[PDB]
Design a protein around this motif. Structure first.
Motif, PDB file in Angstrom:
ATOM      1  N   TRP A   1       0.808  -1.212   0.000  1.00 52.51           N
ATOM      2  CA  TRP A   1       0.000   0.000   0.000  1.00 52.51           C
ATOM      3  C   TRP A   1       0.841   1.261   0.000  1.00 52.51           C
ATOM      4  O   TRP A   1       0.293   2.363  -0.051  1.00 52.51           O
TER       5      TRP A   1
ATOM      6  N   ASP B   1       0.423  -0.467 -10.991  1.00 54.66           N
ATOM      7  CA  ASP B   1      -0.732  -0.888 -11.771  1.00 54.66           C
ATOM      8  C   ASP B   1      -1.767  -1.627 -10.943  1.00 54.66           C
ATOM      9  O   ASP B   1      -2.964  -1.355 -11.096  1.00 54.66           O
ATOM     10  N   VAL B   2      -1.322  -2.540 -10.079  1.00 54.12           N
ATOM     11  CA  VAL B   2      -2.206  -3.241  -9.155  1.00 54.12           C
ATOM     12  C   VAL B   2      -2.938  -2.255  -8.265  1.00 54.12           C
ATOM     13  O   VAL B   2      -4.164  -2.298  -8.135  1.00 54.12           O
ATOM     14  N   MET B   3      -2.209  -1.303  -7.705  1.00 55.09           N
ATOM     15  CA  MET B   3      -2.793  -0.433  -6.703  1.00 55.09           C
ATOM     16  C   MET B   3      -3.603   0.688  -7.330  1.00 55.09           C
ATOM     17  O   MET B   3      -4.589   1.130  -6.740  1.00 55.09           O
TER      18      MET B   3
ATOM     19  N   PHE C   1      -5.328   0.140 -10.035  1.00 52.62           N
ATOM     20  CA  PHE C   1      -6.533  -0.622 -10.338  1.00 52.62           C
ATOM     21  C   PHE C   1      -7.428  -0.752  -9.118  1.00 52.62           C
ATOM     22  O   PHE C   1      -8.645  -0.541  -9.202  1.00 52.62           O
ATOM     23  N   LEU C   2      -6.840  -1.074  -7.972  1.00 56.39           N
ATOM     24  CA  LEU C   2      -7.636  -1.317  -6.779  1.00 56.39           C
ATOM     25  C   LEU C   2      -8.236  -0.029  -6.239  1.00 56.39           C
ATOM     26  O   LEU C   2      -9.413   0.002  -5.877  1.00 56.39           O
TER      27      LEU C   2
ATOM     28  N   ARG D   1      -8.964   2.599  -7.976  1.00 58.11           N
ATOM     29  CA  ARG D   1      -9.978   3.057  -8.918  1.00 58.11           C
ATOM     30  C   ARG D   1     -11.280   2.276  -8.776  1.00 58.11           C
ATOM     31  O   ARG D   1     -12.365   2.879  -8.721  1.00 58.11           O
ATOM     32  N   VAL D   2     -11.195   0.947  -8.677  1.00 57.38           N
ATOM     33  CA  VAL D   2     -12.396   0.125  -8.536  1.00 57.38           C
ATOM     34  C   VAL D   2     -13.077   0.373  -7.196  1.00 57.38           C
ATOM     35  O   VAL D   2     -14.306   0.542  -7.134  1.00 57.38           O
ATOM     36  N   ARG D   3     -12.297   0.445  -6.112  1.00 58.87           N
ATOM     37  CA  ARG D   3     -12.877   0.725  -4.805  1.00 58.87           C
ATOM     38  C   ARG D   3     -13.451   2.129  -4.731  1.00 58.87           C
ATOM     39  O   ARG D   3     -14.453   2.343  -4.057  1.00 58.87           O
TER      40      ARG D   3
ATOM     41  N   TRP E   1     -14.771   3.912  -7.203  1.00 56.05           N
ATOM     42  CA  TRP E   1     -16.068   3.753  -7.856  1.00 56.05           C
ATOM     43  C   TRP E   1     -17.109   3.188  -6.897  1.00 56.05           C
ATOM     44  O   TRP E   1     -18.161   3.801  -6.669  1.00 56.05           O
ATOM     45  N   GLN E   2     -16.782   2.055  -6.273  1.00 57.22           N
ATOM     46  CA  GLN E   2     -17.728   1.344  -5.421  1.00 57.22           C
ATOM     47  C   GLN E   2     -18.118   2.153  -4.188  1.00 57.22           C
ATOM     48  O   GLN E   2     -19.255   2.072  -3.719  1.00 57.22           O
TER      49      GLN E   2
END
Ligand SMILES: [Mg+2]
Ligand SMILES: [Mg+2]
Ligand SMILES: [Mg+2]
Ligand SMILES: [Mg+2]
Lengths: 233, 57, 68, 100, 118
Positions: free
Chosen positions: C10, C16-18, C20-21, C23-25, C27-28
RNA sequence: GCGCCGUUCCGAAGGGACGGGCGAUGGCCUCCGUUGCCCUCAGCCGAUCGAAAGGGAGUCGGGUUCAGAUCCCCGAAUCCG
RNA sequence: ACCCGGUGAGGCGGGGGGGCGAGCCGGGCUCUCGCUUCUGGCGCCAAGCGCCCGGCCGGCCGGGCGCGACCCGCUCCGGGG
């Protein structure tokens, strides 16, 4: 025999013609916001370009292998809370007059016995809900040389241990009667995961459009292909 | 009479003994009967000409 | 232990992994309300550093603040 | 010095619309399968005057395609529409007057 | 199974009753509007005595929280007499006054001589 | 921040009813109700407030007080449940 | 992603199947259609068919399921982006 009073009375469900029957309409429901959210979360995991350290969890150990792994892991379940009290009463009787191997569980214990190379196999759940808990762990098992697999279910990996969920489950020791079966698991799991690992590290995921959008692109491309191929003859 | 006095009245005070009696007038009832008959007879005629258009073709 | 891996993972928020995470979180979390209860910590590691123990009676709410 | 009158009109409360005796939002029928694929008949029930509007409206009554229920609509009356006139609406409707 | 409607209503869950593990207050509160609390005293006014002598009623002064039903039950219990009707007014003093008409097998003058007012 | 905006707008916004089924108490346990569970059926419109001149069932005649009467008394009614 | 519109988020997108036209040797193909336009009427809460099941004496009385009403899908459809 037959009755001429019985009439066949058909309904014409045309436009404007007859009232529509109560047919199935699950596709057009106004769902609650939590359902709507958890569906298009999965839709975004199909749309977006998922990095390979998250994509690798989509590859799951298949069904016929998962049955053999859970059959071997049922032999070495941890003791239940009642069986703890039964063993304490047994040692109590021996006082009034070598511990067997188990499964290790949790990311913390399993990672500490991956670095110490005490793990002989590491089972990883594929649906751990903050994924950052286990993202590193396949690559760490690759470095330390430990066979790792990925099962479907933190729920059912939480049923070997007597809980709700569990992230990871390791094999440290097994018995001599169940030694070659662990080797037969380790061979297939190792050649499916560890030996094929650069292909895992480069494999980006997702990035698939909607079936309606894929169908529209396919209609345009097939129309262009037909209208270019009919010209040559 | 006022609408809540219609709880007090007997049934025959509040309608006339005909189809749509006390809700619709006699002239519109008989034209509604004639219309309901003649539309359906025309639908039968269109059905028969449909069958004959299947016969000629 | 796993927590030092999650800590330095963290810290790599530009990766790229973080990305992605986050951005998706994000949004949610934007789809939910301005104050609501998380059933568990999103960052277990950070919550443990800050005082939280995973026992009965510790509660976590995820709330948003409009920005600027 | 003062707030001028044109600025005062946007706050409302004295400059709001007088919508007491108005009849409804005069709208077309909503989109559904009959509008999109075929057509659907409705009769003109009566033609009516809306306050604050030079156009006359028209109670047009449609039969709901999914429920046994009559749906009634306020169109804006095109000129020459009379009461007891069938009004069609859809992709397959004909090209005559008062027919959407 | 099918969804007939395009809507999702909240499904009807089972819900139970209060099965409390201790009563909140220890004992119920006693009725502090008795039969005695609810009739304070009769009126001995010459207007009230005119009403007693002629119209076969009894003019009492009553607690302000009382119904005509409660005044009827209290007059029936305290003096053992049945009542045709009760008419109530609240005075500008603040008291409620009850004109308790008697069933005509009773004399109001006899029950007024019973309770003392003359 | 006290709070504010907003009133159908980003809500899982229904606690109800006819019938069929399961049981449980009560009455000459007849037949009916009281429920509790299951299947079915269900739109509405936004909680609530807002008129002693608007909408709003149904009381009139005579007599009586120092001061109250369509209110008491006598006689005729009437509405709702 | 984000925004706007409609709706009681009701038949969207592929594909089968059916009919009607054009071209080659009863057949494969491209495309169109999919049931309502003489009238100020009516229209829901399934007819019919197919396969199961229960109580009584082949007959009687109450039930179930599937077609009817095509299958499959990952955004409720649209318009922007
Ligand atoms: Mg009559
Ligand atoms: Mg009010
Ligand atoms: Mg009023
Ligand atoms: Mg009034």
């Amino acid at each position: 025999v037959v009755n001429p009073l019985f009439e066949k009375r058909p309904k014409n469900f045309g436009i404007g013609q007859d009232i529509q029957p109560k047919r199935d309409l699950t596709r057009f429901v106004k769902w609650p916001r939590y359902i709507r959210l958890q569906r298009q979360r999965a839709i975004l995991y199909k749309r977006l370009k998922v990095p390979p350290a998250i994509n690798q969890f989509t590859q799951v150990l298949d069904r016929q292998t998962a049955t053999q792994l859970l059959k071997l892991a049922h032999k070495y379940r941890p003791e239940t809370k009642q069986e703890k009290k039964q063993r304490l009463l047994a040692r109590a009787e021996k006082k009034a007059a070598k511990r067997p191997p188990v499964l290790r569980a949790g990311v913390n214990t399993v990672t500490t016995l991956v670095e110490n190379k005490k793990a002989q196999l590491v089972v990883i759940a594929h649906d751990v809900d903050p994924i950052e808990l286990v993202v590193f762990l396949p690559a760490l098992c690759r470095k330390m040389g430990v066979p790792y697999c990925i099962l479907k279910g933190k729920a059912r990996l939480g049923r070997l241990v007597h809980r709700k969920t569990c992230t990871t489950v390791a094999f440290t020791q097994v018995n001599s009667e169940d030694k070659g079966a662990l080797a037969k698991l380790v061979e297939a799991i190792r050649t499916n995961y560890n030996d094929r690992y650069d292909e895992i590290r480069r494999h980006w995921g997702g990035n698939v459009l909607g079936p309606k959008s894929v169908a529209r692109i396919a209609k345009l491309e097939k129309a262009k292909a037909k209208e270019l191929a009919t010209k040559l003859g | 009479v006022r609408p809540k006095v219609l709880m007090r009245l007997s049934k025959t005070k509040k309608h006339v003994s005909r189809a749509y009696g006390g809700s619709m007038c006699a002239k519109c009832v008989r034209d509604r009967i004639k219309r309901a008959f003649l539309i359906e007879e025309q639908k039968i005629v269109v059905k028969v000409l449909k069958a004959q258009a299947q016969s000629q073709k | 232990g796993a927590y030092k891996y999650i800590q330095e993972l963290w810290r790599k928020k530009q990766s790229d992994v973080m990305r992605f995470l986050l951005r998706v979180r994000c949004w949610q979390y934007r789809q939910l309300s301005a104050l609501h209860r998380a059933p568990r910590p999103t960052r277990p590691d950070k919550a443990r550093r800050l005082g939280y123990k995973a026992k009965q009676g510790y509660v976590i709410y995820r709330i948003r603040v409009r920005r600027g | 010095g003062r707030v001028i009158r044109g600025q005062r009109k946007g706050a409302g409360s004295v400059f709001r619309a007088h919508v007491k005796h108005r009849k409804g939002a005069a709208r077309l029928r909503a989109v559904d399968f009959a509008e999109r694929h075929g057509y659907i008949k409705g009769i003109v029930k009566d033609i009516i005057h809306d306050p604050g509007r030079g156009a006359p409206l028209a109670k047009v009554v449609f039969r709901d395609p999914y429920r046994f229920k009559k749906r009634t609509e306020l169109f804006i009356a095109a000129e020459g529409i009379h009461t007891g006139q069938f009004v069609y609406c859809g992709k397959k409707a004909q090209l005559n007057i008062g027919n959407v | 199974k099918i969804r007939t409607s395009p809507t999702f209503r909240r499904p009807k869950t089972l819900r139970l009753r209060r099965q409390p593990k201790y009563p909140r207050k220890s004992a119920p509160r006693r009725n502090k509007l008795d039969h005695y609390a609810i009739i304070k005293f009769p009126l001995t006014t010459e207007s009230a005595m005119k009403k007693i002598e002629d119209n076969n009623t009894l003019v009492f002064i009553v607690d302000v929280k009382a119904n005509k039903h409660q005044i009827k039950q209290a007059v029936k219990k305290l003096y053992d007499i049945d009542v045709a009707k009760v008419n109530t007014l609240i005075r500008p003093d603040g008291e409620k006054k009850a004109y308790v008409r008697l069933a005509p097998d009773y004399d109001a003058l006899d029950v007024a001589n019973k309770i003392g007012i003359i």
